[PDB]
Design a protein around this ligand. Structure first.
Ligand SMILES: Nc1ncnc2c1ncn2[C@@H]1O[C@H](COP(=O)(O)OP(=O)(O)O)[C@@H](O)[C@H]1O
Ligand SMILES: Nc1ncnc2c1ncn2[C@@H]1O[C@H](COP(=O)(O)OP(=O)(O)O)[C@@H](O)[C@H]1O
Lengths: 689, 604
DNA sequence: CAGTCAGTCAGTCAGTCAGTCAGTCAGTCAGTCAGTCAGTCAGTCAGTCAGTCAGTCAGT
DNA sequence: ACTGACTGACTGACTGACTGACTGACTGACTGACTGACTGACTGACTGACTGACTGACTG
């Protein structure tokens, strides 16, 4: 119609793009036979649910067709400009061809399979009945097919699907090889002129909610006519309906009445979260913003709170404005749909493959002297203190927990303090190791309140209700919780830490909580001595503001002295000035291991569980008789530290079991336990000079 | 023809055409914008295989061009702005779109604060300044739809308008978001081709430095537009020039009315300028003509300029050269080196004065508060929320917690001038321990655990413990804030009150003649010294600070206390800053000599 | 005579619940408005009569 | 054989009852509107608990 709602032409065609997308779907040989008959046959064999259609095979197909002749119609930019029509267009391009019968149905499979099977079979018999009727009423056969295909109501192919479909953006590598769709943007950068494209962000996830079902189509029954009246729901709120809308309970006097059912609808998981700004890509005087994300389908349960993530998705509107008196029409309030999630700091132990990984791991293993090299590698940009780095590698490894069938549980973990002041560069190690380990939270002294690092209760928006929002310690479990300035903590926080020293437990009896939440954390602390520093006139624990019970809960305690000495100063000055002169320290003859390959090594190392033996029983027992024997013949408040509790015995077996894993051997030997006794006797007792 | 417009509109368009072709700088500005976007488009269309559209017009010229057009704009602007915009789009289309204007002034005795705004100034052109609070969120607005049809394969089209459009009125016609054209076919919509244009509204309170004694404040609200989104963070000081429109039907429509007085008011557009304050907001917009950089190059190559600029910050203060040298070395600030895959290393300098009363220790910090840029002064208290944000947000639209920056976040790249440093309690001194080396502020209160950034520089001036006893008993706790706080600070200037007779003379005629090189050149020296260029350290300066540092340990560990590696790092920082002063590129032995002497006088 | 420990007030923080303001609503009732009608008024069209002319007959 | 006297037929003017348009009050109807509050989250003042800083008073 002209003159009201007029027309426009544009260069974009939807005619040959469908044909080209069919040709791409069939003939692609690069990755036995073709690529998508294998994966799509795997889908129809009912062992898979998602389909990843990348944006690299399309571009390589365009350079191949561009060099063969003829000219190929530009399709990649056509996806990148619109990116919403192509899921439905692409998916009805898939459904013409599918290798159906490749395996008979199992009996015990599922319920969604058997529902879609009965819909398909009933659809066939309905389609064959009418051509068994009209064909016997005469009076090439394409015409009779066109007769039957338009006098029969069917289940539409939007409902018999079983899978989902997800894109995947293109690298800088493939765009560099042949010469945009994924430039990593920030949340300030998203102008309001990207609505519809396919973009990429990065930030820290905060406040990820629960997973609860949301409806897509609703299936009623009519009870008299016998139909099944569907209804699609697009909006936030819907409304139920009344008497009927069929073609038999309509045009009659006596309409029926319909009521719903839940084993014939179609559900989908649903979960929303928020991205905060990364706080490194901000201007000078500003505050981090936020931007919502919906998540549908298979991609759910991959957004853990407190991470660094690279979400790529398309960017739609969703209608709302705020107060009614502020509206000007037709303000829209955007969100970000999710398509494919790629994390930095990949989390152990969510990996299985080993074959390609050994090409990098076996280089470190065949490099020779793996252990002291890795001990050199953690935070190389300081000088000195090889023993502290040596112990903190054993913090990052950890292990091994043990259930004894009661079931009372033992740890399983190491707890390390640091002492001395001020210029021994202790904060650099805390930022360092709370940057190497995934799931690592760095909290200062004050700082967090008592309710900041325990959980709290708050009302939840749209999904309901009353979830316990976690604190710092509940966030970082099975990780490392660095702590600055341990002396300035409020005393309630001290009892919280002492409750973490017994395993698993924080207990709350406040105004709305009776729970016992879990925490499997590891604690590294850094306490300062009494003012000013290190008087050998003053006794131990005189210059320490902490009770010796808390000294007993730490199996490993350190102290970093500060004594002026002539010889080390030139090495230290050449070290530091050698890096302000440049940006890399080590030379002659060493290279630092990159941290990603190191996390691959340590992440590989935690799947061993070594087993002790009988000679190490004798050696551990006799060494404990030594330490117990000489530790209690002093009994004074002197530089000696009494009284070598059996937590040192459990801690030294636990350090032996930790050192045995880096040999990757299940071969607990005497160099193991001898190394552990070396770190015990050298660990403390450094205050002699 | 839209409405086949009158010959009046032709008269305004022709006259403003004649003015715009009279003075010919504006044609060159349009040429600059057009060429810049052209060559940017050539880079984005040639290698891989932005600027807005508004011209700043000053109201100087129209007073000497036409009195009619001058006093025409400042009385009834809904009759005179759309013709001039039409003629400017005519010129810009003819030389090679909206093409709005600015009207930078010089305004006509409409310089009024929003205390005295209403209401006989209504529907004129008004300039308003004040504080910005409580800026809302940015939302996109829809203008043009595009629909794909099925199955005939034709796109479609629709427009939308509002009341916050161009400044006239129009008989309104709403229009349903379309679906199911004639004849009956499903219209599946699209995105990516349908346009969108941003929208944001902020409110303005009058100035507290201009306000009356104590009364409630009264405030108005401003709507912004496409190319004016996100200029002003809340807390700035903002000049707004716009049109004081009054839209809405004020309860005269339906009888037995509530909302007793209608006719809500606002301001449209147009040209939000942020301006300099005494304590918040950057002043780095200061102009640098070629005459000025030619003069900087003229004075740049002498051999006494550190001793000239030493005695420049004291026009009326006797003595204390080494303090002045330390303050210039603070204002240059060193260089910031961030490592690869590690943590950065700190760049600036932190200074504590301590000494007897009546020693011009408080007079100096106001002078550093004036000459620098982004100075923020905190005296005494303090708690709560200097180093933090306190998170007190009660956002009305939805349950959400925002942050409201204190004094430490807001003074980024700046100078914090704290007075009476002993009166601070230790609970805030925890936050000063967090700022002065870690350079980050972690807040995990209720809440949202964050890690923002703040990298300020600190000057303090504390009193002695009891009396003026700065030399009498011992240096061991005449100050008594032990001990890490003594180590974080780089320099410890210890100022005494010696009595003499020649000193009484030299003080006397100075103070007497005061009652009866220039700084607005000096800050233009400073910012050009700051942005260009960073130096690198060279081989000639390592051995001086190595020998000097082993000297200071082996002997100053026999004299005084304490010495850490932080002294070595501050030696490197003062070397780099004194290299920045002479506008060089490399590092000479001269720098290590000067910084060595400053640390000798500072410690001994 | 000086350090210290413990008691003690004070400021600040989290929990508590009663007003408060915005959004929705159904019933009814009233205010206007349109459909009803009735009376008016001019135009118009069929019946009816009178005049005039052509045909026809009779008289010279 | 022609002419006047009479005669039917046509044709024009007169007569009135029908026909079509026009526009002021009367009342149902129908839809605003506001009164019927109701609901529900949210916000703002009240109040106790606690932890830190000050100072007497105790002890080396
Ligand atoms: N061995 C060393 N190598 C390099 N830098 C050092 C070394 N020892 C001390 N430093 C310097 O001393 C500083 C120590 O400060 P930091 O570790 O941030 O907190 P803290 O003072 O509490 O240890 C670091 O900034 C570092 O530059
Ligand atoms: N060297 C000096 N030359 C000139 N004026 C001085 C000098 N020293 C002190 N003053 C005077 O001292 C006053 C400032 O006192 P100040 O020492 O800053 O305060 P406070 O010690 O309380 O911080 C000024 O008015 C100034 O006139």
């Amino acid at each position: 119609m002209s003159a009201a709602l007029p027309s426009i032409q544009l260069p974009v065609d939807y005619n040959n793009l469908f044909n080209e997308i069919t040709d791409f779907l069939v003939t692609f040989k690069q990755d036995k036979g073709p690529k998508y008959m294998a994966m799509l046959q795997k889908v129809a064999n009912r062992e898979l649910n998602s389909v990843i259609i990348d944006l690299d095979d399309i571009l390589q197909y365009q350079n191949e067709k561009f060099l063969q002749g003829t000219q190929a119609d530009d399709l990649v930019s056509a996806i990148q400009q619109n990116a919403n029509h192509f899921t439905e267009l692409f998916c009805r391009a898939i459904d013409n061809n599918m290798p159906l019968p490749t395996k008979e149905i199992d009996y015990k499979d599922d319920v969604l399979d058997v529902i879609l099977n009965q819909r398909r079979l009933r659809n066939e018999r309905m389609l064959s009945d009418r051509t068994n009727e009209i064909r016997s009423e005469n009076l090439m056969n394409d015409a009779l097919r066109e007769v039957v295909e338009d006098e029969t109501e069917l289940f539409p192919p939007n409902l018999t699907r079983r899978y989902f479909l997800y894109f995947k953006p293109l690298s800088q590598n493939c765009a560099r090889r042949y010469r945009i769709s994924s430039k990593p943007l920030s949340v300030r950068q998203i102008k309001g002129d990207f609505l519809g494209q396919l973009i990429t962000v990065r930030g820290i996830i905060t406040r990820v909610s629960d997973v609860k079902p949301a409806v897509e189509v609703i299936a009623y029954t009519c009870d008299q006519c016998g139909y099944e009246v569907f209804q699609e729901v697009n909006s936030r709120t819907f409304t139920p309906l009344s008497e009927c809308t069929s073609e038999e309970c309509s045009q009659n006097q006596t309409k029926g009445q319909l009521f719903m059912s839940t084993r014939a609808s179609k559900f989908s998981a649903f979960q929303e979260c928020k991205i905060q700004e990364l706080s490194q890509q901000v201007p000078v005087g500003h505050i981090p913003r936020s931007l919502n994300i919906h998540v549908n389908g298979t991609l759910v349960r991959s957004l853990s709170p407190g991470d660094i993530v690279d979400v790529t998705g398309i960017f739609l509107p969703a209608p709302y404005t705020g107060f009614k008196a502020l509206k000007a029409g037709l303000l829209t309030e955007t969100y970000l749909e999710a398509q494919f999630v790629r994390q930095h700091k990949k989390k152990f132990a969510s990996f299985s493959l080993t074959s390609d990984v050994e090409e990098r791991v076996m280089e470190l293993i065949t490099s020779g002297d793996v252990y002291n090299r890795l001990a050199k590698s953690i935070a190389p940009e300081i000088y000195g203190n090889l023993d502290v780095k040596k112990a903190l590698l054993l913090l990052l490894v950890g292990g091994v927990d043990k259930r004894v069938g009661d079931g009372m549980k033992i740890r399983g973990d190491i707890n390390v303090c640091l002492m001395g002041d001020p210029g021994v560069a202790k904060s650099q190690l805390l930022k360092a190791i709370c940057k190497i380990s995934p799931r690592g939270v760095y909290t200062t002294g004050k700082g967090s309140s008592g309710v900041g690092l325990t959980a709290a209760v708050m009302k939840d928006p749209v999904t309901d209700e009353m979830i316990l929002e976690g604190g710092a310690l509940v966030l970082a479990d099975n990780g490392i919780c660095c702590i600055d300035e341990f002396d300035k903590m409020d005393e309630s926080d001290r009892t919280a830490i002492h409750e973490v020293m017994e395993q698993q437990t924080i207990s709350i009896s406040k105004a709305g909580i009776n729970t016992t939440l879990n925490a499997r954390t590891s604690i590294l602390a850094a306490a300062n001595p009494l003012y000013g520093r290190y008087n050998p006139r003053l006794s131990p624990l005189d210059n320490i503001n902490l009770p010796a019970a808390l000294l007993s809960r730490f199996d490993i305690l350190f102290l970093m002295l500060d004594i002026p000495s002539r010889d080390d100063d030139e090495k230290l000055a050449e070290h530091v000035t050698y890096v302000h002169m440049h940006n890399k320290q080590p030379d002659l003859d060493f290279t630092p291991v990159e941290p990603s390959k190191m996390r691959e090594y340590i992440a590989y190392a935690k799947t061993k569980r070594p087993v002790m033996s009988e000679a190490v029983n004798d050696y551990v027992v006799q060494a404990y008789i030594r330490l117990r024997q000489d530790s209690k013949r002093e009994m004074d408040s002197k530089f000696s530290f009494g009284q070598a509790t059996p937590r040192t015995l459990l801690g030294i077996i636990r350090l032996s079991q930790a050192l045995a894993k880096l040999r990757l051997a299940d071969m607990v030997d005497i160099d193991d336990v001898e190394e552990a006794l070396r770190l015990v006797r050298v660990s403390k007792e450094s205050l002699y000079q | 023809t839209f409405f086949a417009p009158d010959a009046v509109f032709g008269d305004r368009v022709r006259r403003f055409q004649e003015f715009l072709d009279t003075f010919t700088s504006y044609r060159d500005s349009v040429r600059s914008i057009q060429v810049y976007n052209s060559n940017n488009a050539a880079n984005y269309n040639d290698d891989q295989d932005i600027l807005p559209h508004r011209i700043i017009i000053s109201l100087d010229d129209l007073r000497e061009f036409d009195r009619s057009f001058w006093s025409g704009i400042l009385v009834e602007p809904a009759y005179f702005i759309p013709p001039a915009e039409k003629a400017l789009t005519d010129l810009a289309d003819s030389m090679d779109h909206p093409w709005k204007l600015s009207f930078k002034g010089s305004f006509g005795a409409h310089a009024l604060s929003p205390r005295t705004l209403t209401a006989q100034h209504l529907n004129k052109l008004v300039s308003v300044e004040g504080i910005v609070t409580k800026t809302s969120l940015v939302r996109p607005k829809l203008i043009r739809s595009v629909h794909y049809a099925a199955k005939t394969g034709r796109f479609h089209y629709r427009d939308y308008t509002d009341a916050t459009t161009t400044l006239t009125t129009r008989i309104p016609t709403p229009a349903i978001y379309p679906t199911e054209d004639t004849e009956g076919n499903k219209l599946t919509t699209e995105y990516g081709y349908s346009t969108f244009i941003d929208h944001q509204r902020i409110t303005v309170q009058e100035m507290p430095e201009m306000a009356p004694a104590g009364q409630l404040p009264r405030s108005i609200d401003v709507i912004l537009d496409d190319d004016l989104v996100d200029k002003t963070k809340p807390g700035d000081r903002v000049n707004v020039v716009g049109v004081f429109k009054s839209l809405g039907a004020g309860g005269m429509n339906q009888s037995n009315s509530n909302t007793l007085i209608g006719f809500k008011t606002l301001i449209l557009g147009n040209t939000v300028y942020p301006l300099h304050a005494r304590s918040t907001g950057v002043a780095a917009r200061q102009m640098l003509t070629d005459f000025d950089i030619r003069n900087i190059n003229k004075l740049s190559k002498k051999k006494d300029i550190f001793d000239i600029l030493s005695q420049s910050l004291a026009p009326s203060i006797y003595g204390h050269d080494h303090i002045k040298k330390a303050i210039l070395l603070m204002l240059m600030g060193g260089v910031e080196k961030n490592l690869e895959n590690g943590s950065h290393l700190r760049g600036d300098i932190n200074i504590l004065m301590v000494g007897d009363p009546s020693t011009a220790k408080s007079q100096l910090l106001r002078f550093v508060l004036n000459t620098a840029s982004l100075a923020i002064a905190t005296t005494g208290r303090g708690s709560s929320g200097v180093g933090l944000t306190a998170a007190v947000t009660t956002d009305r639209e939805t349950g959400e917690r925002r942050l409201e920056a204190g004094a430490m976040v807001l003074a980024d790249r700046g100078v914090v001038c704290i007075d009476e440093f002993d009166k601070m309690t230790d609970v805030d001194r925890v936050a000063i321990h967090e700022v002065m080396e870690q350079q980050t502020v972690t807040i995990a209160k209720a809440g949202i655990h964050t890690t923002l950034n703040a990298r300020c520089s600190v000057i303090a001036a504390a009193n002695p413990v009891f009396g003026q006893y700065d030399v009498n008993r011992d240096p061991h706790q005449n100050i008594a804030l032990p001990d890490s706080l003594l180590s974080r600070f780089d320099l410890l200037f210890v100022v005494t009150d010696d009595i003499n007779e020649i000193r009484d003379r030299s003080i006397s005629e100075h103070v007497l003649r005061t009652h009866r090189v220039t700084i607005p050149f000096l800050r233009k020296y400073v910012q050009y010294a700051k942005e260009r260029v960073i130096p690198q350290l060279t081989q000639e300066a390592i051995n001086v600070i190595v020998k000097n540092y082993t000297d200071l340990r082996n002997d100053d560990n026999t004299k005084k206390s304490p010495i850490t590696a932080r002294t070595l790092e501050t030696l490197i920082r003062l070397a780099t800053a004194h290299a920045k002063v002479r506008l060089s590129k490399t590092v000479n032995k001269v720098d290590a000599k000067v910084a060595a002497n400053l640390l000798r006088f500072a410690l001994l």
